């Protein structure tokens, strides 16, 4: 739903990188260069941003039961 | 000593609904209502 | 019979990782030191969350979990704090915890990013890794959603919960060339050279060394930002030294306890 | 519902001996050391250090059941040197090795930063 | 008995010497003997034929001991 | 002048340990020194092995006859 805080396999913090990754992808970076820019070297960490789907953006479309 | 506050559906506005009252929103008359979060202590391990 | 004479040589030291080489030590000692880096190295992490009010699309436990995983700058306070279970005070106190507060409400039209900058702390030395780069996204809020919670960060270690694991990735490796044949390759030439291979591009693996022990254990300890990466290693050594001092105490007592 | 709390891998209960020694019956000079609330982090170093002792005939360890917080190190040495002291010494000096490592790493670190 | 330790411990006999203990196969071994350095011999209640190999094992072990450690003694 | 097999069937041994254990649980006197075990099954087993169980097996034959065999008379298998 929301980007995981830490990579499940090793523990590297990746929760602070989804917005950055989106900005890099807003530029014409290829997702592989984007991942290198964000410093994700191990494939376990790269799997986090490549495979993440941000569903919280869909869940926010609904009006809240304030 | 609470009159039993509920949250409307399409309105999202707190209405006081006592027992033996029909569930109708004070405004627009929507029939769906949700209870507001408990006041009891909520504590998690964050695990 | 007596203790062997270990050595160390740091090859790279950054604020994120340390690459070092240990000589004259056992295969078991080098792996136990690795294991301590993962499990038995204390750090501060949120372990108690009182959710006053949560109307975000994320659930109370979801929020709690995410808060638990946020790394806190644990460099001097962690070696001074008392384990919460060991602390004598009722509830929490500065001697055994760091209080955190996050009271946030979205009123502006645009969606609010509830990052770790909203996690206010009762101590100036223990805060999310934000000293000096974006922040860990905790929640996304719509107009009219809120999140108000109190939290306490406890001293713990990675053997109890992964939250207290100070490392991102530990690269333990020894004998880059297959000198001891501890691993047997069906086709040794299909395998890329290790980063530490003292081997030319001609030969595939070092010639078999019959009489030879593993030494020169290469490490790459990467921190999650909680502990400085060299302090993780020092914290391992002090903690293992304590484990052996205490175990010898209990053993000696058990010998006299006949 | 039946999940054990994570603390049970290291927190001592009421009555639990940190270590329990029992003599082994099948051979002379052999004991079984049973550590409670410990695992392979402590089992591999003690096993390996025991093997450097030229007076240690046998040294090794097992975790009787992985969900049981108990490990068994077994030591058997020459008749002129009890297993108890074999264990004691291998820790007496293992502590020294880790202190020696601490001292040597601390100087290598201060030597790397601006050096 | 000589070699009995003055504290009443018989170990100077059994730990230096190959002991024997004759019991039925079924009987749960004696706790002192199981702690002591003594060779158990298992006998059947009804199968008399299985007795001969047991005693042969006795003479075998005894001869091993006599020849390795007490061959200088006279037979 | 009995013709049944002089060996104790696995069923006979089982039902003997079952019944004798239950009697011991109801503290009928035990025929052999307890070294200190307390599980009635372990005591019943010890009795059996010492051949002191006070039970005779009434073995019915298909024709209607029967032969009483003391537990101490026939041979145990295990
Ligand atoms: Zn990873
Ligand atoms: Zn309404
Ligand atoms: Zn406290």
UniProtKB/TrEMBL annotation, chain A:
Its main location: nucleus. InterPro entries: RNA_pol_su_RPB10 (IPR023580), RNA_pol_suN_Zn-BS (IPR020789), RPABC5/Rpb10 (IPR000268). One of its GO terms (cellular component) is RNA polymerase II, core complex. Belongs to the archaeal Rpo10/eukaryotic RPB10 RNA polymerase subunit family. One of its GO terms (biological process) is DNA-templated transcription. This is DNA-directed RNA polymerases I, II, and III subunit RPABC5. GO terms for molecular function: DNA binding; DNA-directed RNA polymerase activity; zinc ion binding. Zn(2+) binds at residues 7, 10, 44-45. DNA-dependent RNA polymerase catalyzes the transcription of DNA into RNA using the four ribonucleoside triphosphates as substrates. Common component of RNA polymerases I, II and III which synthesize ribosomal RNA precursors, mRNA precursors and many functional non-coding RNAs, and a small RNAs, such as 5S rRNA and tRNAs, respectively. The lineage of its organism: Eukaryota, Metazoa, Chordata, Craniata, Vertebrata. The gene is POLR2L. It comes from the Eukaryota. Keywords: DNA-directed RNA polymerase, Metal-binding, Transcription, Zinc. It is found in: Nucleus. The keyword Transcription applies. Pfam families: RNA_pol_N.
From TrEMBL, chain B:
Zn(2+) 2 binds at residues 8, 28. It comes from the Eukaryota. It is found in: Nucleus, Nucleolus. One of its GO terms (molecular function) is DNA binding. GO terms for cellular component: RNA polymerase I complex; RNA polymerase II, core complex; RNA polymerase III complex. Zn(2+) 3 binds at residue 30. One of its GO terms (biological process) is transcription by RNA polymerase II. Keywords: DNA-directed RNA polymerase, Metal-binding, Nucleus, Transcription, Zinc, Zinc-finger. Zn(2+) 1 binds at residues 8, 11, 25, 28. Belongs to the archaeal Rpo12/eukaryotic RPC10 RNA polymerase subunit family. DNA-dependent RNA polymerase catalyzes the transcription of DNA into RNA using the four ribonucleoside triphosphates as substrates. Common component of RNA polymerases I, II and III which synthesize ribosomal RNA precursors, mRNA precursors and many functional non-coding RNAs, and a small RNAs, such as 5S rRNA and tRNAs, respectively. This is DNA-directed RNA polymerases I, II, and III subunit RPABC4. The chain holds residues 12 to 58 of 58 of the full protein.
UniProtKB/TrEMBL annotation, chain D:
InterPro entries: RBP11, RBP11-like, RBP11-like_dimer, RNA_pol_Rpb11_13-16kDa_CS, Rpo11-like. It comes from the Eukaryota. The keyword Lipid biosynthesis does not apply. The keyword Cell membrane does not apply. It is found in: Nucleus. Gene3D superfamilies: RNA polymerase, RBP11-like subunit (3.30.1360.10). One of its GO terms (cellular component) is RNA polymerase II, core complex. GO terms for biological process: transcription by RNA polymerase II. Keywords: DNA-directed RNA polymerase, Nucleus, Transcription. SUPFAM superfamilies: RBP11-like subunits of RNA polymerase. Pfam families: RNA_pol_L_2 (PF13656). Residues 31-103 form the DNA-directed RNA polymerase RBP11-like dimerisation domain. GO terms for molecular function: DNA binding; DNA-directed RNA polymerase activity; protein dimerization activity. Its main location: nucleus. Belongs to the archaeal Rpo11/eukaryotic RPB11/RPC19 RNA polymerase subunit family. This is DNA-directed RNA polymerase II subunit RPB11-a.
UniProtKB/TrEMBL annotation, chain F:
Coiled coil: none annotated. The keyword Disulfide bond does not apply. It comes from the Eukaryota. GO terms for molecular function: DNA binding; DNA-directed RNA polymerase activity. GO terms for biological process: transcription by RNA polymerase II. It is found in: Nucleus. DNA-dependent RNA polymerase catalyzes the transcription of DNA into RNA using the four ribonucleoside triphosphates as substrates. Common component of RNA polymerases I, II, and III which synthesize ribosomal RNA precursors, mRNA precursors and many functional non-coding RNAs, and small RNAs, such as 5S rRNA and tRNAs, respectively. Pol II is the central component of the basal RNA polymerase II transcription machinery. Pols are composed of mobile elements that move relative to each other. This is DNA-directed RNA polymerases I, II, and III subunit RPABC2. The chain holds residues 50 to 127 of 127 of the full protein.
């Amino acid at each position: 739903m929301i980007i995981p805080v830490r990579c499940f396999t090793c523990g590297k913090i990746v929760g602070n990188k989804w917005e950055a990754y989106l900005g890099l992808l807003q530029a014409e970076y290829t997702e592989g260069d984007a991942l290198d820019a964000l410093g994700l070297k191990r494939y376990c960490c790269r799997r986090m941003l490549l495979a993440h789907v941000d569903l919280i953006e869909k869940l926010l479309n609904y009006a809240p039961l304030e | 000593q609470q009159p039993m506050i509920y949250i409307c559906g399409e309105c999202h506005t707190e209405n006081e609904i006592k027992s033996r009252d029909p569930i109708r929103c004070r405004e627009c008359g929507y029939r769906i209502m949700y209870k507001k979060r408990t006041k009891r202590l909520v504590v998690f391990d964050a695990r | 019979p007596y203790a062997n004479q270990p050595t160390v040589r740091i090859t790279e030291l950054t604020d994120e990782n340390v690459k070092f080489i240990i000589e004259n030590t056992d295969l078991a000692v080098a792996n136990s030191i690795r294991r301590v880096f993962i499990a038995e190295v204390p750090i501060i992490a949120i372990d108690w969350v009182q959710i006053d009010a949560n109307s975000s699309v994320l659930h109370d436990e979801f929020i709690a979990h995410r808060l638990g995983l946020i790394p806190l700058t644990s460099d001097d306070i962690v070696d001074k704090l008392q384990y919460s279970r060991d602390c004598t005070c009722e509830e929490f106190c500065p001697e055994c915890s760091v209080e955190f507060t996050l009271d946030v409400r979205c009123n502006e039209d645009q969606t609010r990013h509830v990052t770790s900058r909203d996690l206010i702390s009762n101590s100036p030395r223990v805060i999310p890794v934000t000293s000096r780069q974006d922040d860990i996204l905790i929640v996304k809020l719509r107009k009219g959603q809120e999140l108000r919670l109190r939290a306490y960060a406890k001293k713990g270690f990675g053997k109890e919960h992964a939250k207290w694991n100070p490392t991102a990735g530990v690269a333990f490796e020894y004998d880059p060339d297959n000198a001891l044949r501890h691993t047997v390759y069906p086709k040794p030439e299909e395998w890329p050279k290790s980063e530490y291979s003292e081997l030319d591009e001609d030969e595939s693996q070092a010639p078999y060394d019959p009489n030879g022990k593993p030494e020169r254990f290469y490490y790459n300890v990467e921190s999650c930002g909680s502990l400085r990466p060299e302090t993780i290693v020092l914290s391992a050594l002090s903690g293992l030294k304590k484990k052996l001092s205490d175990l010898q105490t209990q053993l000696s007592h058990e010998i006299q306890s006949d | 519902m039946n999940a054990p709390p994570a603390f049970e891998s290291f927190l001592l209960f009421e009555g639990e001996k940190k270590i329990t020694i029992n003599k082994d019956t099948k051979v002379p000079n052999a004991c079984l050391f049973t550590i409670n609330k410990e695992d392979h982090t402590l089992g591999n170093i003690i096993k390996s250090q025991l093997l450097k002792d030229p007076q240690v005939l046998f040294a090794g360890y097992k975790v009787p059941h992985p969900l049981e917080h108990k490990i068994i190190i077994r030591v058997q040495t020459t008749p002129d040197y009890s297993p108890q002291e074999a264990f004691t010494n291998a820790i007496t000096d293992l502590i020294s090795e880790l202190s020696l490592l601490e001292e040597r790493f601390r100087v290598a670190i201060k030597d790397k930063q601006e050096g | 008995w000589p070699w009995l330790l003055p504290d009443g411990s018989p170990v100077d006999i059994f730990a230096k010497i190959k002991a024997f203990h004759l019991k039925y196969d079924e009987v749960r071994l004696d706790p002192n003997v199981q702690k002591w350095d003594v060779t158990v011999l298992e006998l059947s209640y009804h199968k008399r034929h299985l007795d001969r190999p047991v005693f042969l094992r006795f003479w075998e072990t005894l001869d091993r001991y006599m020849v390795k450690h007490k061959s200088h003694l006279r037979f | 002048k009995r013709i049944t097999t002089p060996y104790m069937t696995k069923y006979e041994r089982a039902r003997v340990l079952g019944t004798r254990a239950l009697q011991i649980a109801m503290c009928a006197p035990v025929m052999v020194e307890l070294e200190g075990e307390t599980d009635p099954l372990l005591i019943a087993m010890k009795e059996l092995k010492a051949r002191k169980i006070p039970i005779i097996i009434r073995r019915y034959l298909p024709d209607g006859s029967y032969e009483d065999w003391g537990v101490d008379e026939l041979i145990i298998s295990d």
